[PDB]
Design a protein around this ligand. Structure first.
Ligand code: JHJ
Ligand code: JHJ
Ligand code: CA
Ligand code: CA
Lengths: 204, 204
């Protein structure tokens, strides 16, 4: 009875890990497709499964960081969303912190995404008329040539500057989508998706 | 690409059905063991998975009703919880409505549970000093010999009456736990739990 409860708890922890990987895969696919409502619903399911986790491997921590990173990027223009205990941290700044924590290769795409999030963290403040907040985000991030150009834009209040059109929010989204495609290909072979695909294919 | 998206959506619907059955099984086990916090966390996960459902079979509707029924029973003494659009319906009255809707055998245990929920729906109002609400719950439910005894208790405001000690909240819980044991035995062979148990047993 005591050892049976233990085997039951271990089996629940295995099933939760399979559910976490599947929801991360579904969250990446909805992010890549731009299916906003499916992303919202899947995010809610991933948050609940994470709250119930019995144990955590290094691979599961990376999966959690990936889900949290996409959530913050999706909320990038929602300056009223508070992702940290420090109420001053904006969603794109929270995404930047997670990006610097994930155990992943720092290839050229990694740095391109990092720099696009840095520029957009300032740009989204400027677009809403939050000029003082843009300077505070800049000070927190910066903690150059690129750096001095950004401070000049903030001081001029040049919201629709050509610089933000070349290093745009859409460009940040497209570079993140390229990374998401790699995560999708990697997690497509996880247990629950493979088993579900086999059931579907067998009925075809 | 269009047919690939379709196969992907079908596979996600299969995986969601497997997750729903597993969470119902975990919810039943936590209810049976009296693990209140595990029940709360599992309930949150089941609610999120239900909100994301792509399709629904008669078996999945029964599983949803089972989860909702246990939630209402667990909230039976929380008269501030509103489970219906009509704000007047108490949690045990909401549990009674679901109990009368589930496609299940109406054996002796079914009726014993039904009658215990009816008595306790009044008893929980009386225990909180809600004498007028107890009469309103009685009118909604009733909609005898048992019936006339209850109206007499409500009019006398006899909160700690011997009748409520014989048809007690604990007795209602124990009868519901006997039904939960049957649901647990039936759902123990569902895909995700069977596959997780095999992984655990293989490492022993
Ligand atoms: C970066 O954000 C998060 C990181 C980790 C968790 N959860 C977590 O560590 N849970 C856990 C459960 C049981 N054993 C060990 C660990 C939640 C959020
Ligand atoms: C008794 O409470 C509930 C009953 C059913 C649902 N969901 C539901 O019917 N979803 C669905 C999704 C796609 N195709 C058909 C149906 C939710 C709550
Ligand atoms: Ca704000
Ligand atoms: Ca109330």
């Amino acid at each position: 009875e005591e050892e049976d409860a233990g085997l039951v708890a271990e089996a629940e922890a295995v099933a939760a890990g399979w559910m976490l990987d599947f929801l991360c895969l579904s969250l990446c696919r909805a992010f890549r497709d731009g299916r906003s409502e499916d992303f919202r619903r899947t995010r809610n399911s991933a948050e609940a499964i994470i709250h119930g986790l019995s144990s955590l491997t290094a691979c599961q921590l990376r999966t959690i960081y990936i889900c949290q990173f996409l959530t913050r990027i999706a909320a990038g223009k929602t300056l009223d969303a508070q992702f940290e205990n420090d109420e001053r941290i904006t969603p794109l700044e929270s995404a930047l912190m997670i990006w610097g924590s994930i155990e992943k290769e720092h290839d050229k795409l990694h740095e391109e995404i990092q720099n696009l999030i840095k520029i957009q963290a300032i740009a989204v403040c400027m677009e809403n008329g939050n000029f003082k907040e843009a300077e505070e985000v800049f000070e927190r991030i910066f903690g150059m040539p690129f750096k001095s150009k950004l401070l000049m834009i903030i001081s001029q209040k040049d919201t629709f500057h050509s610089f933000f059109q070349h290093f745009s929010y859409n460009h940040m989204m497209e570079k993140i989508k390229s990374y998401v495609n790699y995560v999708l290909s990697e997690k497509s072979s996880t247990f629950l998706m493979k088993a579900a695909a086999k059931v579907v294919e067998s009925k075809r």
